[PDB]
């Protein structure tokens, strides 16, 4: 039962890694020249369009895909260098903790759905005005998609700390 | 019969991951900007694009494409790691199951036509306004060969469920 | 002379598919994009443009060559899996008709030439009207080349036909 | 002083392919969304145009690199499977013939240079229009450099003629 | 302690070298297309954004992700094509000199920020104008990663210098 | 003292091949998009823009990258296909010659700088007209620098030269 966890771990995360690479680049793609509001100002859809997308889903996506792998990196070229089992734990307890953060953090950052409209109020734009977004289906399958995987993730891992730690 | 039927899987298979790479990724490259609506709405045609076309054909491929392909990666990192026979049956029974699920699912989502009007009612347009999507005719040709592909991979993989199969 | 012919339907398939490769896929590039018409109304332009190129050229010669190249592909999973001869038979059989075919459907499909004005009368369009194709020389040339090719190789696939068969 | 003909023929080649490869696919790039003619007529641009470039320099060239290169895989192949040097004989009076064929053929398309002004009198334009060229010098020096570099082969397969050839 | 060092010295640089080729090459991809100055004045756009941005953070940070590599390989040509000690410290220092330099050069030629409104004062413009910039947040948080990886590389260099250092 | 000459002049000339296919493809990518006259002429951006820049930078580069490479090829074929010493001396003398006419080439043709204006005076163009250049301090510090890099080349061919040569 426990044999099986990491043969579904590495087939998910090198899902979650294909998944993005293949089809996330292309989605976003015209985040910016699509999205517009009801507007005459100069300089209103730069400002509105980066308080309503400060940081990409892709940007954040592909950060976490480098980031969560970092510990399989260090411990091969610790091996390729020269406890092993020391390193084996700390780095388990590091990827259980990066996944967590990162879970968190995507909840915190965007939620769960990617409405179709936006109201901003930034300058330099007069009172409040109204911008619509590109593509706010498919963005939120992709969110609640990614979310899913990610919670995969992080429950195996759990899974393997509570099965080797004390 | 059925000896020759693993290896004409095999070519379907590799047939239709060869269409969706080479093909697939340029059709459906102008989806949006050629998508124009009869308005003067800012938004109109973003909100009657998205309703139109909530996820595109060729995401929705490509993820089906790379789903249907699990259980072989499980099988091979279960094999490379270490019944045998036990997972072969369980595989079989899941890529049997997942295909019939997206054909399915495909004819739910798409229909068997992508037609040249849409009528569009969502806010912000004003009541009922007419939209023209690009490239009607290619869109209806593809979706059309997919689901003939899919319908003969799931034919096959039937027919395997039945050969061993009790 | 038999013995050449294999040789030089084995250079010509691979000149084909160079071919189509390197340069088809930027020839037909902004095919829509540069397509106009003569008209103020909305929709004109996509209908039109999907009345008079339903498939485009490259599209049709992608799949032909894909599907060409499948009996190829089934006689080598087939051989590595495990008459023979009797398989070789059938898989020139069927690159025979397969090739006779697809060369009748591009004579039916397209023609000979790729003309500079045509005339459309689909909704929205009112009544007739006039719209303008983009590097209709080049494609001209293209088509004609193409056809010439896919000749050459059912001549070649007639000849062995014709040295094994009885 | 026969020896290190090979070598500067093979280098020149690989050098013709490599520049052809490299840099021409994008000075091209622009050729038709650049170009511009004095005029309110639609499709007057599309069809002078087309008038002025009928095929586009680099697809000649490319063409013209990949049918040059073609008794070299002939004789491979016909190697590989199994007189030779009658062979040897043969494609070398095939090579020099395709290579004057397509430096005159060359020389009678194009010329040798590319003017900035173009003056066009094709329907749908109005009498004779005056057109924009983008890129003139450039492509002229293309063209010429071009041409240089295949008189030199030509040079060097007529020297391997006479050498062989009696 | 001194030994783990190494370890994370050289997965720091992957890991910059990686976010760099794949995630920034695209964030900075629409910068001037985006960029937008409040003025009827041709060649103003230009201008300001000349001025805003000299060098794009990108090119500084490929050309020094590329210039801090250097030593490495001119210790393996050395290596290659043959004291020893001796390059290994002239290296050593040389890597730490140059990532000092430039991380001293980003910040005084980019600060640790990115505002949303320029003022620009240079010809063509009359008097000054206010210009916007496009995804100022997300170029704000690549230069405070990049500048934490710099500053992570550089004590790390220090530590390794004053560890063989006397 | 000699003996660490040619490993740097190899580093020196594979990090110039890197500079150039990494970052140097995409400064220039806008660069007649972005280039803009104060005129109502139609033809007149595009004579004024061929007339400020006839050969791109990075086309002169790409070129020269390609040529200074030439003899290394040609010694390469030469002693595949089979004095030699004679063969180093004399594509020592070569590659030297190329690159002092490259770099005097390079300063005869571009200078040291690219001006942010342009003033041009080619038909169409009623009299002199006023042209704005994208990105020119970019282009300046491009310019400087790659006249740096090929001048330590020619300073270490020079070397060698006069280490040999007598």
Known sequence: ????????????????????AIVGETVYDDEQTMFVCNTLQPGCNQACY?????????RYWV??????????????????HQGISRF????????????????????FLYGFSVPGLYECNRYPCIKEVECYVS???????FLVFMFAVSGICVVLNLAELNHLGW
């Open 135 to 141: 593509r706010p289906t498919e963005k939120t399958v």
């Open 88 to 107: 084996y734990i700390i780095q388990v307890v590091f990827r259980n903790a990066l996944e967590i953060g990162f879970l968190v953090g995507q909840y």
């Open 50 to 58: 980066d308080r309503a997308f400060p940081i990409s889903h892709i």
């Open 1 to 20: 039962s426990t044999m099986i966890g990491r043969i579904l771990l590495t087939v998910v995360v090198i899902f979650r890694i294909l998944i993005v």
């Open 63 to 80: 950060f976490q895909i480098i980031m969560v792998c970092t510990p399989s990196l260090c411990f091969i070229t610790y091996s390729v």
